[PDB]
Amino acid sequence: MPNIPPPFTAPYAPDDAEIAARLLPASHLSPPQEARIHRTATRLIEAIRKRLGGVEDMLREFALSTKEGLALMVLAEALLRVPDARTADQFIEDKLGEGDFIHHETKSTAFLVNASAWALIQPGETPDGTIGRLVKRLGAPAVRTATRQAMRLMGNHFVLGETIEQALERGKPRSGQKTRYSFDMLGEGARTAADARRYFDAYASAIETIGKAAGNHALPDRPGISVKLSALHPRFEAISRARVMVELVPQLLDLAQRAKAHDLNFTVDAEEADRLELSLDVIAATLADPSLKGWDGFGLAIQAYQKRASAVIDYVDALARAHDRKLMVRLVKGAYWDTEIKRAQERGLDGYPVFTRKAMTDLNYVACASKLLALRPRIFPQFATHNALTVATVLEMAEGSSGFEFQRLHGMGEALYEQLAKDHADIAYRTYAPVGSHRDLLAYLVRRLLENGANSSFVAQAADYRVPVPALLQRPADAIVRPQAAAHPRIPLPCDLFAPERRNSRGVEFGARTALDQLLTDVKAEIADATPDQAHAAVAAARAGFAGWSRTPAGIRAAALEQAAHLLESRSAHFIALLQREGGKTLDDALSELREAADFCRYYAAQGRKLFGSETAMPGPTGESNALTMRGRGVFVAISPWNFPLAIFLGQVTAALMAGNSVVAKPAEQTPRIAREAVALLHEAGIPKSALYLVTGDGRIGAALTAHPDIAGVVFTGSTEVARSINRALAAKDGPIVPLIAETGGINAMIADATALPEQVADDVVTSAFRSAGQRASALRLLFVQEDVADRMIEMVAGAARELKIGDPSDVATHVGPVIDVEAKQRLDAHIARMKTEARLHFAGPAPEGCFVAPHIFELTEAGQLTEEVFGPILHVVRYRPENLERVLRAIERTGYGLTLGVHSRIDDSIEAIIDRVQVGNIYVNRNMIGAVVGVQPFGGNGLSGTGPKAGGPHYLARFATEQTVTINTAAA
Amino acid sequence: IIDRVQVGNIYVNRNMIGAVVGVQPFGGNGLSGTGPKAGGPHYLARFATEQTVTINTAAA
Amino acid sequence: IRAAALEQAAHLLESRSAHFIALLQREGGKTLDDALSELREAADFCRYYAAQGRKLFGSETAMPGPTGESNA
Amino acid sequence: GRIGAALTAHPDIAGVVFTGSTEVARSINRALAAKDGPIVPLIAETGGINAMIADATALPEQVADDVVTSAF
Amino acid sequence: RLVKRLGAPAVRTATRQAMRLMGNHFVLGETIEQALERGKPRSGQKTRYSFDMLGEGARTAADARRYFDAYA
Amino acid sequence: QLAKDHADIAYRTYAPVGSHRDLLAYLVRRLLENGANSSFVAQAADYRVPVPALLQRPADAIVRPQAAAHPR
Ligand SMILES: Cc1cc2c(cc1C)N(C[C@H](O)[C@H](O)[C@H](O)COP(=O)(O)OP(=O)(O)OC[C@H]1O[C@@H](n3cnc4c(N)ncnc43)[C@H](O)[C@@H]1O)c1[nH]c(=O)[nH]c(=O)c1N2
Ligand SMILES: Cc1cc2c(cc1C)N(C[C@H](O)[C@H](O)[C@H](O)COP(=O)(O)OP(=O)(O)OC[C@H]1O[C@@H](n3cnc4c(N)ncnc43)[C@H](O)[C@@H]1O)c1[nH]c(=O)[nH]c(=O)c1N2
Ligand code: PRO
Ligand code: PRO
Ligand code: PRO
Ligand code: PRO
Ligand code: PRO
Ligand code: PRO
Ligand code: PRO
Ligand code: PRO
C-alpha cells in the first residue's frame, strides 16, 4: 500500500489569475464535443421550460424576498401540522391576512421549537410584520394563495416532524419497498452536548430506516445518507482540534459502521472553508479504522468553488489508495459563498478561499469533474448540480461510460434529469430529500433560500422565460476570456476594504493550520510608580511641548500615526504576547486588539488630514475672506482601562495627538507594560518626546493629573464613579471649562423574539456575554427572550456556555481566560453569591484553579433586579410576554445606561420600533454586540454610558480641538 | 500673530464686531467659553448624540 | 419638519421686523442700526441652523464595512 | 438667577446652553458635575478681554474707525 | 425565434394557452353567420354579453355592405 | 368584487364578435393596450408592483400645470 497522506495543508487563498492561466487553455473542447454539449444542454433546458412547482418558482411568482419566502414556508409547515385540514383552510381564509400579522409570524416560528406554543381580529389593523408588509404589497388574497403554494412545497419536498421519529415515520416506504430517495439529514452546528447526541441518534435512526428499505442491489444502487460533522460535535473548530479528534472520530466511526452493515452510501457533507482541514483530519482518522474495510460506500463532498478543491481530490485519492478503499465522492459547487466572502473581509485575510466569479467556480467544477472521472474505478464520483450546462459538459467528458452518477435535491432538477434519462439510457442520478425535525428547519431553510433566490443561480434563470436559452449555454471560459479577469472586479480584497481612504490591518485564518501554527510559534517566541512631583513635571513638560506639536503640519502628525500602525503590525507577535501575558487575553482577542490598535492609528490619521489639513472657506461678501480651522487645545490627560490596554490606550492617545495636543497618558495600574511599549513605539514612529509622556501609578496619580490647572482636557475610559469625580475636579477649577470625553460602560441588553433563529441567538449571546470573560464595556448583561422560546433559548445558551474551555489564555483551545486580578474575581464572586440567593440559576460553570470566573447564567423575575454593571462572564435573562415589549423597553431605559443593545428578530417593523424608541449608542441586529470595528461601528453611547463623541467615528477628533475663524478685509488689494 | 494666539475670532484690518451667521462662526476658548462656535458647522452636533445601527443582512 | 419650522420662524421675524426692532430699542436700549442688525442675525440663525439641520439630521451616514452587513 | 439655578440643577435635563458671565458658567458647570446622573454637555460663551494690535503700516484713520466701532 | 428563446415545449404550452384565450374571450367564425351562431344563447335566454363587432375601415364598397349586413 | 361591495352596481360586458378576416386588424390594436407598460391591467397583474403604487391619484402625479405635457 502507498503512504497515508500528511495532514491536509494547501494554500488558503492563492491568486485567481494563476489558477485561471492553467484552467482556461485546458477547458478547450473539440468542435464535435462542444456541439454535443450544446445539444444536450439545449434539450435539458427545453424540458425545464416545458411546464410540480418549486421554491424558486414561488419566489419568482410573487416577487418575494428570501425573508418573505422564509416566513411563508414556516407558516406553511405549521399549518400542515394542524390536525384538521379544514381548520387550516378556515385559518387561511378568515384570519391570515386579515390581521394579527406579527402574531401569526411569531407563533408559526415558535412552533418549530415549541410545538405547544401555537393552537388555532378587529378590522382596520395596520399591516406590519413580514406578513403584513406582504399583504399591503400583494393583497391578502395573493398572500393566501402564496401560503397555499408554500404548503404544497413543504409537503412535497421536505420530510419533517416534531421529532426525528415522526419524520422517519412520515418518510417510510411500504414494507418490502426501497426508498426512492436518499436522506439529506437536516442538522448542523450542535450548540450543546445534548445536541450532538440527538443528531447522532437521528442519523443512527435514519440509517436503520433506509437500511430496512434498501432493496437488493449492490452499490452504487442503494440509498444514501448525508451527515454534517458540525452536527456531531458542539465545538467543531480548528482551535478545539484536540478534543474533536478524541471525541468526534469515534462518533463518526460508529455511524459509518452502522451504514456499512446496511451497505449504504455514507457521505460527509462539506461545510465552511475554515473547517476543511479539520474535516479531512476527522475523515482520515475514521476511514483508517479496519472496521470499514470491504465496504465501498464511505465518502465525502468536495466544494469546487474552493481554490483548494483540486488538492482535496488528490488528498482523498491518496487516502483511498493508502487504505485500499473504494470511495463515493460528491462534487458540489458550494453552499457557503456569501459566508466565505464576509468572513475573509471581517478576518482581514490576504485573499478569499473561494473564487469570486461564478464562471470560475463553473470552470473549476468541470476541471474537478474531469479529474474525478479519471480516478474511476477506485473513486465513484457523484456530480451534485442542477445546472443543465454543467450536467451536459460532465456527461460529454465521461464519453458515455458508467461508474459515476448525478445527484439532485428533491424539488429541483426533476425535469432536467428526467430528460437526461430519456436521451441517455445508462444515466444514473440520486435524489436526496431533506429529512429531520422542525427545530432544524429554520437554519436549513435560510441557506436553501439563498441559492434559490440568488440572481446568478442557474435554476432561477432557466425558469425565467425572460432569459433566452442561448444565454444559459455560454461556457465558463468564454465568460472569463483572460486570466487577469479571474477575480471579480467589484469585490475588493480584504486588505482593500477601506481603500482609498486607508489601509486595513491584516488578520489570521485560524482554520488554516499553517497560519495558526506560525502565529502560535511567533507569539511563543516572545515599573516604578510616578511620584506626584514626576506627574507634575510630566504635565509641565507636555505643556512646553504643546506649541511645537500643535504647529507641526497635520500630514506630518498623520504620517506618525500611520508609521505607528505599520510598526504595530510588523511587531504583532510582541504585542500579542504582551496582551496574553499582561492582559490575560485569548489569542483571538489579542490579535483582534492589535488590529484595532493599528486601525485606530490609520483612521484618526485619515480623519486628521481631512479635519486639520486645510481650512474651510466660508461664503460671504466680496472683498473679505473667512476661513475656519481647528487647532490643538493644549495638554490632554488620557486615562485608559486594563481591558483594552493597547487599543483604547492608543485610540485615546493618538486622537489627542492627531488633533495637535500634547498628551500625558496614565494607563491602568494592571497593564503598564504594554502602555510603555506603545509609547516607545509612538516615539519611534515620529511622535516627539516633548509631545507624549507616560505616567504610571494609582488612582491618586490619575487624580493629580486631572486636577492639574494647566491641562486642556481629559479623555477617559473606565467606571462611572471615577468619571464623575474627574468631572467634579474639572468643574471645581477656576480656570477654563475644558472638555471631558468619557466612556463608562453599560448594562447592555439584548431582545430576542420568537422569529429569531434560536441557534444564532445562542451563538451571539454566548459570544457577547462570555468572550473575554465578559470583560468588555459592550458585553451582553441582560437577555430579554419571548416566553414562547425562552426554554429552548436559555437551555441552548447554557449548553453552549458549558462547552467553552476556561484556562490559560496561551493555550490555543481556551475560550475564557482569567479575569484581570484577584480583586476583580472577588467582586464577581460576590455578585454571583448574591444572585444565587436572589434569582434562578441556570448555569454555573466549573472554574479552574486560579484567577478565573466561569460563565454564569441567572434568570430574574424582573430587569430591576440587576442594578449594576458586573464586569464579568455573568449573563442575566428575563423572559417576557410579546404584548409587554413596552415594559422591556422601559426596563432598559430605567438603568440609565445606553452603550450596546442587541436585537434578534426577523421582523423589520419590530427592529425599527425598537431602534426608534431607545437612545442606545450601538444597536446590533441579528449578530453579536461586541468587537466594534474602527470606522465601521463608531463606538460609544449616552446617559451613564458616557459623553461621546463616538470613538472610531467621524466626530471624535474635533472634540479634542478648538475652532478658529480668520476674517481678513482683503479690499485694500 | 495668527500662528501664536489661540483666540477664536481674528479680524484683520476691519472692526471686531457683528459676526455674521455662517460667515464668521463665532466663539472662542479659555475663559471665553467651550465651543462649539455659534453660527458655524460644528454647532448643532453638540446638541445631539450619535447612534450606530449595525444589521447583519446576510440572511437576505 | 423641524427645519421648516425654523425657516417659517425666519419668515415671520422679517415680516414683523418693525415690531421686534421696536422691542430691541425700547427694552434692549439698542440704536436703530444695532436693532436691525440683531433682527437680521436672528432670522439668519433660523435659516442657517435649518440648513445645517437637514444636512446633519436629515439622513444617515453609511459606514464602509464587510459585505453582508450594513452600518449607519 | 435662582430660577436659572433651579433649571440647571434639575436632574432630568440633558444639557445647558449658556451665554453670559464666566462666574455663572462655572457655577452651572459645578451644579452639573455635582449631580449623580449623566455627564451632560455645557455650551458656554463667556466674553473676553479682547485686544487689537495696530502697527505703523496700518492706515491710522481706518484703525480709528474700527477702534471706535469695536469699543463703543 | 420564440422556439430558440423559450424552447419548443414552452411554445407548445403558450400556444395551448392562446387557444384557451381565443376560445373563451372571442366569438369568431369564417363568416359572421358562423360567429353569430357560435355566440347564440339557448332559445328563450338572454345573451350575457353585448357585441363589440369586429370591423373597421371598409376598403371597398363590398366591404361596407358586408359590415352593414353583419351588424344588421 | 365591485358588485360584491356595492349591490346596486351595473356593469356591461362586451364580447368581440366577427369573422376571421377582421381578427388581425382588431388583435393588433388590442395587443397594444395589453402590452403597454403604463397599462393598469398589466401593472395590477404584475406582483412586482405594490398595490399602493396603483393608487396614486392623477393630480398627485402631475402636481403642477407646467408639467402637463410629457417632457420626452
Ligand atoms: C445532492 C446535493 C448535495 C449537496 C449540494 C447539492 C446537491 C444537489 N450542495 C449545494 C451546492 O454546493 C450548490 O450550492 C447548489 O447545488 C447549487 O449549485 P449548482 O451547480 O446547482 O447551481 P448553479 O450552477 O446556479 O451554481 C450556483 C453556485 O455557484 C457558486 N457561485 C455563485 N456565485 C459565485 C461567484 N460570484 N463566484 C464564485 N462562485 C459563485 C456557488 O457555489 C453557488 O452555489 C452542497 N454544498 C456544499 O457547500 N456542501 C455540501 O455537502 C453540499 N451537498
Ligand atoms: C367596453 C369598452 C368599449 C371601448 C373601449 C373599452 C371598453 C372596456 N375602448 C378602449 C379604451 O379607450 C382604452 O383603450 C382601454 O379600455 C384601456 O383603458 P383603461 O381605462 O382600461 O386602462 P388604463 O387606465 O391602463 O388606461 C390606458 C389608457 O391610457 C391612455 N394613455 C396611455 N399612455 C398615455 C399617455 N402617455 N398620455 C396620455 N394618455 C395615455 C390611453 O388611452 C390608454 O388606452 C375604446 N377606445 C376608443 O378609442 N374608442 C372606443 O369606442 C372604445 N370602446
Ligand atoms: O462556526 C464555527 O466554526 C465555531 C464552532 C462553534 C462556534 N463557532
Ligand atoms: O469600566 C471599567 O473598565 C472598569 C473595570 C471593571 C468595572 N469598571
Ligand atoms: O475538555 C475540554 O477541552 C472541553 C472544554 C470544556 C468541556 N470540555
Ligand atoms: O466593541 C467592543 O467589544 C469593545 C468595547 C469597547 C470598544 N471595543
Ligand atoms: O468640542 C467641540 O465639539 C468643538 C467643535 C469643533 C471643535 N471642537
Ligand atoms: O459679534 C458680535 O459683536 C456679537 C457678540 C456675540 C456674537 N455676536
Ligand atoms: O456632543 C458631541 O460633541 C457629539 C459629537 C457628535 C454628536 N454629538
Ligand atoms: O456677559 C454678559 O452678558 C454679562 C453682561 C455684563 C457682565 N456679563
Residue numbers in the entry:
A (entry chain A): 1 to 51, 55 to 123, 130 to 535, 542 to 988
B (entry chain B): 929 to 988
C (entry chain B): 571 to 642
D (entry chain B): 714 to 785
E (entry chain A): 142 to 213
F (entry chain A): 428 to 499
Could you share sentences copied from the article?
Proline utilization A (PutA) proteins are bifunctional enzymes that catalyze the oxidation of l-proline to l-glutamate. PutAs contain two spatially separated active sites that catalyze the two reactions of proline catabolism. The proline dehydrogenase (PRODH) active site catalyzes the oxidation of proline to Δ1-pyrroline-5-carboxylate (P5C) with concomitant reduction of the flavin adenine dinucleotide (FAD) cofactor. The intermediate P5C is in equilibrium with its hydrolysis product, l-glutamate-γ-semialdehyde (GSAL). The latter species is the substrate for the GSAL dehydrogenase (GSALDH) active site of PutA, which catalyzes the nicotinamide adenine dinucleotide (NAD+)-dependent oxidation of GSAL to glutamate.
The BjPutA C792A variant was used for X-ray crystallography. Cys792 is the catalytic cysteine of the GSALDH active site, and C792A is devoid of GSALDH activity, but has wild-type PRODH activity. Soaking the crystals in 2 M proline bleached the yellow color, consistent with reduction of the FAD cofactor. X-ray diffraction data were collected on a flash-cooled crystal, and the structure was determined at a 2.15 Å resolution. The asymmetric unit of the C2 crystal form contains a BjPutA dimer. The dimer is a domain-swapped assembly in which the oligomerization domain of one protomer engages the GSALDH module of the other protomer. Although the degree of bending is lower in BjPutA C792A, the direction of bending is the same as in other reduced PutAs. These results confirm the FAD in the BjPutA C792A structure is reduced. Nine proline molecules were modeled into 5 sites. Three of the sites are functionally significant: (1) the GSAL binding site of the GSALDH module; (2) the NAD+ site; and (3) the substrate-channeling tunnel. Accordingly, proline in the GSAL site has the highest occupancy (1.0) and lowest B-factor of all the sites.
